[PDB]
Every structure is written in C-alpha cells, then in structure tokens.
Amino acid sequence: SIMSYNGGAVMAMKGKNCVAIAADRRFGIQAQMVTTDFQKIFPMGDRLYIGLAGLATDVQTVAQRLKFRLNLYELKEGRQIKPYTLMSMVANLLYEKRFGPYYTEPVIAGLDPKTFKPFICSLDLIGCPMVTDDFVVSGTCTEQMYGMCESLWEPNMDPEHLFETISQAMLNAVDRDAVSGMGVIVHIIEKDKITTRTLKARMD
Template structure:
C-alpha cells in the first residue's frame, strides 16, 4: 500500500486519475486486508468494504444497507452485484457492465 500511496502523492499536482483498491492478506497476521486510496494517495483502511470510482457516493448507501458480517460466497456475490448494478444505473459516467469475482 505504501508504494502505491507514495506514487500517487508524488504526482499530486498532475495526478493519475485512479482510485486503486488494494486487497490481500496482512503478511504478519494473515488476516484479510482491504483499503482504497484517493487521487493523491491518502489511504482509507477498513474492516468491511471499500467503494471507489465515479459512482462511489451511490454505492456507499447501498453497500451499508446490504452488507453483513460473515456472508457466505453466494450472498456476498448477490450483494456486490446488486450494489454495482444499482450504482451504474444511477451514474451515467461510470460505464456499462460489471464483472464480479468472489474468491
């Protein structure tokens, strides 16, 4: 995460127009880790979910209402799919289509 944050901060006056999401396992505890970074590299670390992109405002409300701790993969897939499709329907800039991968 630090490397990506430093790269984004270095280009803050001519930023890369991206909001990366970093997911993986913490190397010390092997617990799941997820965070997102804004255009200038400021991280938002959370324990449950992150949203990113042009439709982030629309997705926060949907994700907060649908997300529950310890969801099974099928329920998680359905929740992510519904949140993404509803956000894309409400934001014309976000594009068309969604691909969801649950590991």
C-alpha cells in the same frame, strides 16, 4: 470534472475469510461509449488485486508503473507483497506526483499471504490511504455505491453471500449512473481459489 472524463466504478468488500472486488466495464469518452471490456482490475499477486477508477490513461499508466515496482520488489525480496505493503507502495507512487497528480483513485482487495486475513483499502488521487473493515468504493457513482453498501453489507459473510451483496450493490449503483456500467466483473478471492464472474447488466 477531470476524474469523470471517462467514467468508471470500482468497489471492494470484505467477507468472513474472503474479499470481493468489482468494476464496471465501460470505456468511453464523455457521453460516447468506445468499448465495453476495459480492464480496471489488475492482479498484483496470487490473492491481491487493485482496481483503478478515474482517467483511463492514468488507470493504465498507474497499473503499469505499479507492476514495474512490484516486480522489482518481488525479485529483490523473494516473497510476495503483503496488501498493506502494496497500499504503502501505491501511496508513495501517488504522492510522488503530489502537484502533478495521476487522476486515479485506487482500491485494493486481498488476503494476507501466509495469513489469509482479508484486507481492503482505498486511496485518494494523491495517495492518502483509508483502510476499512466493511467496504470501499471509488469512481463516479460513490454516493449510489455508499447507499447500496451501507444498506446491504453484513459482517462475516460467506463467499456466496459476499458475491450476491457486492453484485447487487454494483448493479443497482451503476444502473443509476450515466457514465458507468455496460457490464460488471466481480472477483471473489478465497484462500484456495479465485472466482471471476461477469454479471448480466443493462447496456444503455
């Protein structure tokens, strides 16, 4: 109930040498839409992104506190954080509030620095990490996203096939959820470039 207060949906998907992360764009309070360009996907590096679903206040708070800790980390160590290290840092941040939890479920998509091996993971609200090799979902329409991703995902997709797969999964999943949608943003992370797209979507 609390996690569904603002709605929202985030999804990450693994390609052959690339990752994709997509989110709905609606910010609303219960049934009422407020805006249609709420940011849920934040960059934590050149090739590392975190998407946050759940309470919008906790989305913003956790993104800002993670940016705090990540900036300190990357100043103390003269290197960029690895996706596994970012996942551990996020889990520690969430578990610090074990009994007063932040109401967000993060999704992490990235490429290994200096290795460029795709990494995706999801965490629950108290920071239990789950690394997969195909896809992770988070938000208020995880059942629909699971149907779409389990049906459509294939191993070793090139970035264009990956974009089509994650786009169709997100679009058809949020078309079937009342409090998500109003546009979809997709990031495709390759080793040499990042592609950001907004999909044509239903606005009802």
